[PDB]
Amino acid sequence: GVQVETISPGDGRTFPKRGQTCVVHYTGMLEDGKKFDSSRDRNKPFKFMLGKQEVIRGWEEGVAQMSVGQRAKLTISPDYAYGATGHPGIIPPHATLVFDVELLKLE
């Protein structure tokens, strides 16, 4: 459902726990490489609470595998993203997504 590939290693020791706030920089892309969303374009980190299910399933399972300071590519199946319906206009039906995520800190 999510496959993690490291771009830059983190500390290899500090991984998120349920209920912590993950502070990330990210870029999300369709399978064709076209970015649809990026905190890097806004120039402001994005925050989510791990376990709240306020981000897609491939984020909570993928970021949970990351340590502080790690940058990684998360390849997310539609099953772990927006499924059969997608988000029409932005995310097509049955879309595989790629996110470039850096885990900045935990709060």
UniProtKB/Swiss-Prot annotation:
SUPFAM superfamilies: FKBP-like (SSF54534). Keywords: Acetylation, Cytoplasm, Isomerase, Membrane, Rotamase, Sarcoplasmic reticulum. The modification N6-acetyllysine is found at residue 52. The modification N6-succinyllysine is found at residue 52. Pfam families: FKBP_C. PROSITE patterns: FKBP_PPIASE. It is found in: Cytoplasm, Cytosol; Sarcoplasmic reticulum membrane. Coiled coil: none annotated. It is a peripheral membrane protein. GO terms for cellular component: cytoplasm; cytoplasmic side of membrane; cytosol; membrane; ryanodine receptor complex; sarcoplasmic reticulum; sarcoplasmic reticulum membrane; terminal cisterna. Inhibited by both FK506 and rapamycin. Its EC number is 5.2.1.8. Its main location: cytoplasm. It catalyses: [protein]-peptidylproline (omega=180) = [protein]-peptidylproline (omega=0). Residues 19-107 form the PPIase FKBP-type domain. The keyword Magnesium does not apply. One of its GO terms (molecular function) is signaling receptor inhibitor activity. One of its GO terms (biological process) is regulation of immune response. It is an enzyme of class 5 (isomerase). Belongs to the FKBP-type PPIase family. FKBP1 subfamily. Interacts with TGFBR1; prevents TGFBR1 phosphorylation by TGFBR2 and stabilizes it in the inactive conformation. Interacts with ACVR1B and SMAD7. Identified in a complex composed of RYR1, PDE4D, PKA, FKBP1A and protein phosphatase 1 (PP1). Interacts directly with RYR2 and RYR3. Interacts with GLMN; rapamycin and FK506 abolish the interaction with GLMN in a dose dependent manner. Interacts directly with RYR1. Keeps in an inactive conformation TGFBR1, the TGF-beta type I serine/threonine kinase receptor, preventing TGF-beta receptor activation in absence of ligand. Recruits SMAD7 to ACVR1B which prevents the association of SMAD2 and SMAD3 with the activin receptor complex, thereby blocking the activin signal. May modulate the RYR1 calcium channel activity. PPIases accelerate the folding of proteins. It catalyzes the cis-trans isomerization of proline imidic peptide bonds in oligopeptides. This is Peptidyl-prolyl cis-trans isomerase FKBP1A. It comes from Homo sapiens. The lineage of its organism: Eukaryota, Metazoa, Chordata, Craniata, Vertebrata.
